[PDB]
From a paper:
The coronavirus 3C-like protease (3CLpro), also known as main protease (Mpro), plays a crucial role in processing two polyproteins (pp1a and pp1ab) encoded by the virus RNA genome. Inhibiting the catalytic activity of 3CLpro has been proven to be an effective strategy to block coronavirus replication. In this study, we have identified mutations in SARS-CoV-2 3CLpro that confer resistance to WU-04. To understand how these mutations affect the WU-04 sensitivity and the catalytic activity of 3CLpro, we solved the crystal structures of these mutants and aligned them with the crystal structure of the WT 3CLpro.
The S301P mutation, which is far from the WU-04-binding pocket, indirectly affects WU-04 binding by restricting the rotation of 3CLpro’s C-terminal tail and impeding 3CLpro dimerization. Residue S301 is located at the end of the last α-helix of 3CLpro. It precedes the C-terminal tail (residues 301–306), which is involved in 3CLpro homodimerization. When S301 is mutated to a proline residue, the Φ angle of P301 is fixed. Consequently, the C-terminal tail cannot be rotated and is restricted to a conformation that cannot contribute to the homo-dimerization of 3CLpro. This finding indicates that the S301P mutation destabilizes the homodimers of 3CLpro. The S301P mutant showed a significantly decreased dimerization ability (Kd = 17.81 ± 7.32 nM) compared to the WT 3CLpro (Kd = 0.94 ± 0.21 nM). The ΔG value changed from –124.75 kcal/mol with the WT system to –103.90 kcal/mol with the S301P system, indicating that the 3CLpro homodimer is destabilized by the S301P mutation. Compared to the M49K and M165V mutations, the S301P mutation had a moderate effect on the binding affinity between 3CLpro and WU-04 and only caused a slight increase in the IC50 of WU-04. Conformational changes in the three regions are also observed in the crystal structure of the M49K/M165V double mutant, but not in the crystal structure of the M165V mutant or that of the S301P mutant.
Author numbering:
A (entry chain A), B (entry chain A): 1 to 303
Write the structure that this text describes.
Amino acid sequence: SGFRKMAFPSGKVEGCMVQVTCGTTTLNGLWLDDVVYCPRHVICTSEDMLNPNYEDLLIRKSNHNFLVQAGNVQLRVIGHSMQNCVLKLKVDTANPKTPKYKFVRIQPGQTFSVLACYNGSPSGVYQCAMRPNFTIKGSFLNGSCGSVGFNIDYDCVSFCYMHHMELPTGVHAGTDLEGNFYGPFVDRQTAQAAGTDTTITVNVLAWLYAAVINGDRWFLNRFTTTLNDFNLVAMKYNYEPLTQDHVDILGPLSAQTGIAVLDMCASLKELLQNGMNGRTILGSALLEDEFTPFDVVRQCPGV
Amino acid sequence: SGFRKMAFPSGKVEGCMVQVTCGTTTLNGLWLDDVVYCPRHVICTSEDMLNPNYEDLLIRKSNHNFLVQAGNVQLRVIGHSMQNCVLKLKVDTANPKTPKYKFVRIQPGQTFSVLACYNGSPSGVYQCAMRPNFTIKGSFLNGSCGSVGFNIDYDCVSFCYMHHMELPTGVHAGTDLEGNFYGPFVDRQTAQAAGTDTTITVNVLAWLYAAVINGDRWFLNRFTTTLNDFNLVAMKYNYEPLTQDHVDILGPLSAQTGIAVLDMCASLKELLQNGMNGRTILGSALLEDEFTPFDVVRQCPGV
């Protein structure tokens, strides 16, 4: 038993991390087959980042201007191109450690593991949710650009995130592996607004189900509610509106615990209106929203 | 910036996990050099676990009764012995993926990464603290026995924990890699008391320092205190007593932030006496105690 925020084992991804240097900017790249992926602002000076013209800057870079280091061995760069906000460096050698992989663009509220890296070396691994405003609340210190977020399905690694930016508010922004930013953000050092950071309602619900399964039951109440009546409450508390698709994906959790999804919604409603009274749920003193229903089910073998 | 609970990259440990079967009991083993380490209760039936005589049970096992599977290939068992509560299976083949490693017995309040495994396959990775009562609050579902806890120092893996038991209260107990239990626990299915689960004061302090460094400053107060006067408060709230060694290890955090350790103690005292008033610190609505000072410093490059 027990329930923990848990990242996927990072070994398949560790073997793909490289160091990419252009001029005096060094960050992390991802080495899959004979292509190295990294943030295009590897080509920028600190002054360039205030307002860069990436096309003009890249014009002045040749293959030999990109230094790519996997551990201590050289990769020879035989080609480069810019796909949206990522650079694709063609190298002379296929990574022998390349796993089965796909590139995925994930949906807001979905979760993934981040392998925080520094200078091409993995430093740590932790679980992240893509917030509804398309930021993540990570731990990205200097030199962590190019670190990636991924999910693993048996032996297939789905890369979904590459770290690019910290916004002036201290949250983090980045792209999928085709270089398209999540959210309205740009790789420029300017003030950028994340909208309201609303709570991922379907995830809080799944986590309450996890709590019940693990024997935390105090918040279970005597009320039920309706979808619209809950959403009326959800909107006041900046909760994502709940939809019948969300109800559907909670079905197996509802079936295991015998608690109808709308009864759990009514318990959540009372928690939002009354607070938690200094109690905890699964060791937390607030409502956790970075576990998807799939995350919960992976840790509840009864489902 | 940002601050996250973060485990070490698990790749060096993934390559050492194997599946160990004896009779119809299957759990995880750790394959280092030509020896496989696993919980000795792999040899027990469910009925045996109520009150096992491990010596008598092992008498009836030969080398060929232990089935060891690394992925899909066989390991040939050429010897077995019982070191305290672990079995050491000598196999015919040195693991080619064996990293540099040591066996360490960790101190209460120290932290480590757990690679949760099932049937020899890594499932996830998360950070744990050894509680002062020598339990951990993990996520260990059926078949996770033998999963290990470790720390990594550049390229050296320090194994410190092997999972053995869930106590009837839902917390977890286990051994070091010489098979000596942490705490007073035994590998028998009986009621076993963990004492009072006190809070790791020095860790809460380090995490408050991390909060300051990350710009969470509201709880900083105008008071200072004394070691004995703080401990007087600590004891009432079941906090571990603070010692001059603890003050010493917080020194670099005190130096970076300019906040004397006893001023931070006074801020903590006010938090314990007044609560957090529905505010958060580093996104948490309670005081976190599973970050050591070393953990914090690894994520605060200014220290």
